[PDB]
């Protein structure tokens, strides 16, 4: 009877482990029974509790394949099935109240951000993300990394690159599993190269060179080169060739964001070092891009803050700064201040540890 309760539970976990294509024959047919299994004498008990005996991951694996819409087949106004999942996951979400829930709770948020990333709208993300903070000391190294990956994706549409760079770089330094070195690793790399492109600071893909397929690399190089050399012409023809690629990965958003960046990168390489830079040169470069908006674009260029310049067109010179800092006041001290904060948090962990 003690044994009976326990025996049901061990059986429920066991059925969940088996069904990743062993003694199985249709993940979707079986879903009904998996929902059935989950909720009595398991999901029910845990009301103020969280564990790694309850795991969204097992159910995630199951649910993910159905969302290729090949079992739905787009015969229908909306999926029922995803709505059901979402209803049920949100039902857990209530139960969590940030007292001991950070564990399983965090997976549900990964799932929720994924559905927005497939085809929803990513403005709803903001609250979940905030709710979802509370000291994290029970989430696994792979889980941290996936969450960051999804979070980074959110940030990028919202036009927040720096924040996304920090998270993706922090992600790849979790996960000693050899199972997240496989295709997942490739996806992660993709996103780190995209963020590098957006900032437009972009280094060469050297590091990536012995950790991706040479097939992946060459197109990936092609994009980076397009930005770096600073041609619109080069960039457009690279988009044209590797159309299937940018579509496939779903990082088609680049084509909007990057175009304005590419043209700016192209002025930047042309030097702005001395007290005046003659107007004719800068006009010449721009003339190739567009010669009806040479004043409008240079003005916009300055406004952005990427580069900064002064123009007289009653002298017809463009006046510029070095683009090199000074050390004589608070701004290097602010870097000193960030570093000491980082050290203290780290110190607190070593002592605790």
């Amino acid at each position: 009877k003690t044994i009976e309760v326990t025996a049901e539970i061990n059986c429920f976990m066991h059925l969940l482990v088996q069904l990743f294509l062993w003694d199985s024959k249709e993940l979707e047919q079986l879903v009904e029974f998996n929902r059935k299994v989950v909720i009595p004498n398991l999901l029910c008990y845990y009301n103020l509790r969280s564990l790694n005996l309850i795991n969204a991951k097992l159910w995630f694996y199951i649910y993910l394949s159905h969302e290729t819409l090949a079992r739905s087949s787009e015969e229908i106004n909306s999926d029922n099935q995803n709505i059901i999942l979402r209803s049920t996951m949100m039902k857990f979400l209530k139960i969590a109240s940030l007292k001991h829930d950070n564990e399983t709770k965090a997976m549900l948020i990964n799932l929720i951000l994924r559905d927005f990333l497939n085809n929803g709208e990513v403005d709803s993300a903001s609250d979940f993300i905030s709710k979802l903070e509370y000291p994290h000391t029970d989430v696994s190294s792979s889980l941290e990394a996936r969450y960051f990956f999804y979070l980074s994706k959110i940030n990028a549409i919202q036009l927040d690159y720096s924040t996304a760079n920090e998270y993706i770089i922090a992600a790849i330094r979790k996960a000693p599993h050899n199972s997240k070195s496989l295709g997942f690793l490739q996806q992660s790399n993709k996103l780190h190269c995209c963020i590098q492109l957006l900032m437009g600071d972009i280094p060469e893909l050297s590091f990536f060179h012995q950790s991706n397929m040479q097939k992946s690399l060459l197109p990936y190089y092609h994009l980076t080169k397009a930005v770096k050399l600073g041609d619109l012409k080069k960039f457009t023809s690279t988009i044209t060739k590797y159309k299937q690629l940018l579509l496939k990965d779903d990082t088609y958003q680049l084509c909007v964001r990057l175009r304005s960046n590419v043209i700016k990168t192209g002025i930047r390489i042309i030097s702005l070092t001395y007290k005046k830079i003659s107007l004719r040169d800068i006009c010449l470069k721009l003339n190739l891009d567009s010669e009806q908006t040479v004043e409008y674009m240079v003005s916009r260029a300055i406004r952005d803050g990427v580069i900064e310049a002064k123009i007289n067109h009653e002298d017809g010179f463009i006046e510029t700064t070095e683009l090199l800092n000074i050390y004589d006041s608070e701004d290097p001290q602010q870097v000193f201040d960030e570093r000491i904060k980082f050290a203290n948090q780290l110190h607190d962990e070593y002592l605790v540890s």
Partner: protein, 272 residues
């Protein structure tokens, strides 16, 4: 505006003979009937009116309501009809009741976000769009705000302006949104000019902003708080440093020291 007693017929025929204001007047009594039937909501459970029959009549009543509402200048009502309408348009696979006026409404909606200068929402909207590339790129109505968004982003304002004038839809119902859009660009141009130029002539600023009268530009320059001489505009203020509360922070003299000590003090406390 009557035609017959029945609301469906009356609205279509009134709408047909013009009288968009009337149509808005009709819209609440129709909406109240629509709510009851439960056709108004997107349908998840089978009813034989999930995307056919009396559902097609409902879809049509929202399409017309949206068209009438924009033509009367009721942005608010345009948003309400289009929000109701959009799950028909796409969800993640909603593909079972498509019209071509759908296309016209979305281009208007894309333009509505665009004119307010919601860059992020334009990015989110493409994401909701089920096929991003095929629907958007083929369709010529939809192509005008997309071409426009690129050219605005780069700071190729003059090209965006030329493309908006020559459109098909400018004739139609992009006329409503043009007024809002034009102010949006002139403000961004005014702001670009304040930063870059130390000085520039008045005649030049007049051409860059799209006026063909000097006096409309001196009035705007003056609202923007630029000083002007006879035959020249001056930008001694290329910015406007300060702006109420937010101090003991950045470029002071001894509140910085206090802060330096204080960071240390916390750091000591933790170590020790």
């Amino acid at each position: 505006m009557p035609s017959l007693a029945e609301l469906t017929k009356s609205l279509s025929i009134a709408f047909e003979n013009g009288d968009y204001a009337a149509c808005e007047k009709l819209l609440p009594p129709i909406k109240i009937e629509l709510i009851k039937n439960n056709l108004l909501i997107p349908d998840l459970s089978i009813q034989n009116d999930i995307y056919l029959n009396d559902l097609m009549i409902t879809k049509r009543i929202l399409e017309v309501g949206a068209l009438a509402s924009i033509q009367t200048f009721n942005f608010d009502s345009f948003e309400n009809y289009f929000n109701q309408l959009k799950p028909y348009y796409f969800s993640n696979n909603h593909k079972l009741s498509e019209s071509d006026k759908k296309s016209k409404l979305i281009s208007l909606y894309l333009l509505n976000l665009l004119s307010q200068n919601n860059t992020t929402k334009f990015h989110s909207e493409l994401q909701y769009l089920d096929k991003h590339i095929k629907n958007l790129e083929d369709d010529s109505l939809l192509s005008y705000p997309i071409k426009l968004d690129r050219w605005l982003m780069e700071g190729s304002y003059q090209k965006a302006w030329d493309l908006l004038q020559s459109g098909s839809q400018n004739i139609s119902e992009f006329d409503s949104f043009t007024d809002i859009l034009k102010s949006a660009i002139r403000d961004e141009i005014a702001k670009n000019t304040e930063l870059s130029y130390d000085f520039l002539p008045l005649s030049n600023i007049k051409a860059l902003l799209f006026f063909n009268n000097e006096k409309e530009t001196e009035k705007f320059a003056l609202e923007r708080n630029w000083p002007i001489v006879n035959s020249k505009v001056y930008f001694n203020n290329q910015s406007k440093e300060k702006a109420d509360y937010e101090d003991e922070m950045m470029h002071e003299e001894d509140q910085k020291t206090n802060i330096i000590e204080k960071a240390m003090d916390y750091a000591i406390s933790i170590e020790n």
